[PDB]
Amino acid sequence: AWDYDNNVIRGVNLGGWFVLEPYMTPSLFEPFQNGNDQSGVPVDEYHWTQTLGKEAALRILQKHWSTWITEQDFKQISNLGLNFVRIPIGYWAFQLLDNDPYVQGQVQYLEKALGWARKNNIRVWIDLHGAPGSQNGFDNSGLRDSYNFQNGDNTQVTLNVLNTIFKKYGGNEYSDVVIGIELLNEPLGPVLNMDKLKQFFLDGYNSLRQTGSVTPVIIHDAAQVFGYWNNFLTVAEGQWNVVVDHHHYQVFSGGELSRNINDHISVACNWGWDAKKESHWNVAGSWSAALTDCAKWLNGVNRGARYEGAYDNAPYIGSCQPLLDISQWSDEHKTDTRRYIEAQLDAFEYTGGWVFWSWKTENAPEWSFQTLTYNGLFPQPVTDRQFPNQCGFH
Ligand SMILES: OC[C@H]1O[C@@H](O[C@@H]2[C@@H](O)[C@H](O[C@@H]3[C@@H](O)[C@H](O)O[C@H](CO)[C@H]3O)O[C@H](CO)[C@H]2O)[C@H](O)[C@@H](O)[C@@H]1O
Ligand SMILES: OC[C@H]1O[C@@H](O[C@@H]2[C@@H](O)[C@H](O)O[C@H](CO)[C@H]2O)[C@H](O)[C@@H](O)[C@@H]1O
Ligand SMILES: [Ca+2]
Numbered sequence: 417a418w419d420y421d422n423n424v425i426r427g428v429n430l431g432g433w434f435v436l437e438p439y440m441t442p443s444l445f446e447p448f449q450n451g452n453d454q455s456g457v458p459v460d461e462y463h464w465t466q467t468l469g470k471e472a473a474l475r476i477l478q479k480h481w482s483t484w485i486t487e488q489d490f491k492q493i494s495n496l497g498l499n500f501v502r503i504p505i506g507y508w509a510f511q512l513l514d515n516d517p518y519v520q521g522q523v524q525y526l527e528k529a530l531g532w533a534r535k536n537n538i539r540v541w542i543d544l545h546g547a548p549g550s551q552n553g554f555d556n557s558g559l560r561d562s563y564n565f566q567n568g569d570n571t572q573v574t575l576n577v578l579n580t581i582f583k584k585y586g587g588n589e590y591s592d593v594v595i596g597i598e599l600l601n602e603p604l605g606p607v608l609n610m611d612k613l614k615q616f617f618l619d620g621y622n623s624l625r626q627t628g629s630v631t632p633v634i635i636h637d638a639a640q641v642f643g644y645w646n647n648f649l650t651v652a653e654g655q656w657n658v659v660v661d662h663h664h665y666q667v668f669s670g671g672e673l674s675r676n677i678n679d680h681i682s683v684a685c686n687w688g689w690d691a692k693k694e695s696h697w698n699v700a701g702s703w704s705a706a707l708t709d710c711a712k713w714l715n716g717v718n719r720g721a722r723y724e725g726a727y728d729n730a731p732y733i734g735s736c737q738p739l740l741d742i743s744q745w746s747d748e749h750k751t752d753t754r755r756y757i758e759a760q761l762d763a764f765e766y767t768g769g770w771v772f773w774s775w776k777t778e779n780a781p782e783w784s785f786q787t788l789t790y791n792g793l794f795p796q797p798v799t800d801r802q803f804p805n806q807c808g809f810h
Pocket of ligand 3: 672674
């Protein structure tokens with residue numbers, strides 16, 4: 417339903433929908449602030465549903481699920497020249513651990529989205545974004561600061577949830593819409609046992625194919641160096657329709673933020689060169705326009721920004737307040753942003769294409785394809801270049 421050789425993914429994440437991310441929907445978390453004191457604000461969806469209790473969590477999430485993304489979104493996405501969406505969902509949509517605080521109901525909207533994608537000629541990856549015990553300790557796994565996906569029975573539970581996704585979404589009913597099932601969003605390889613992560617990926621690949629599914633398996637790169645996965649899940653071993661998902665940002669350390677704009681573009685170009693050398697099909701499944709980590713709570717609730725020397729002992733570069741609203745941005749920041757977005761587009765189009773993080777946010781413009789487009793900073797059409805050939809690809 418997709419040509420990974422010939423065609424290029426031009427997509428957005430439907431992030432912040434089935435897995436809450438404080439920086440994406442701060443209004444859902446702000447009511448727990450006591451003036452300027454953020455110490456009472458739930459740091460993730462696990463804590464947010466636990467604090468609210470099941471009734472209120474379901475009331476509030478139903479209102480969110482039903483309005484955050486609708487068919488009109490899919491129409492706009494198509495209108496803008498995009499051909500693809502990546503849809504994060506948490507394991508808890510399918511299975512609760514004993515005593516999980518999460519509420520369910522997301523599958524109804526996932527299924528409405530797959531129909532809206534069909535209606536609008538949009539293809540989809542289903543992405544298991546959060547595993548039990550957390551695979552990365554990010555708030556976007558559902559459970560911040562926990563790293564227990566390989567603890568206890570959590571890997572087996574993650575496999576069982578995958579089997580459910582494989583049966584529901586990897587078969588004939590959606591073979592015109594679903595062009596990938598992603599086994600696990602950003603397992604944080606540096607803190608995990610990679611041998612056990614590889615076995616988990618091989619188990620997921622084998623279970624999906626054993627269902628009769630021909631759907632591509634999307635393996636996230638687990639933060640490994642380019643090429644690390646080249647000899648895993650290979651044609652030589654009869655393991656086929658496998659795509660590696662790489663994520664790329666330059667904002668989550670002091671060193672990467674410190675780069676001048678030319679060096680940020682050189683790094684973006686080099687992602688393209690390096691991805692070209694890889695042996696599997698590969699797509700930049702998450703990236704953004706961000707040159708700063710200024711967005712409120714991007715690093716988590718009750719954490720500041722490295723960009724203004726307020727997190728992680730990073731040195732101060734600049735103040736975040738003027739970068740919060742795209743109408744306060746300097747002409748220099750607007751120009752840096754357009755340059756950066758075009759360079760990443762060119763790099764990611766050099767292999768399988770790209771899936772911007774994310775379609776929309778409440779008020780974080782570096783992370784909103786809609787806001788950036790409406791402000792002329794994301795190319796529209798997406799092939800438009802004000803800064804052509806920054807990378808010199810051949
Ligand atoms: O929280 C918002 C945003 O988080 C994104 O995930 C990032 C991780 O990708 C990131 O990984 C870092 C790298 O970007 C960088 O190059 O190297 C350092 C190591 O020195 C990495 O830590 O880690 C941060 C936490 O620091 C995560 O938030 C998601 O992809 C995005 O979808 C999410 O909305
Ligand atoms: O190039 C790596 C990808 O190769 C795929 O094998 C085949 C392609 O090389 C070929 O050109 O097209 C056929 C038809 O779809 C592919 O099977 C693997 O299947 C992929 O897993 C791999 O990433
Ligand atoms: Ca910089």
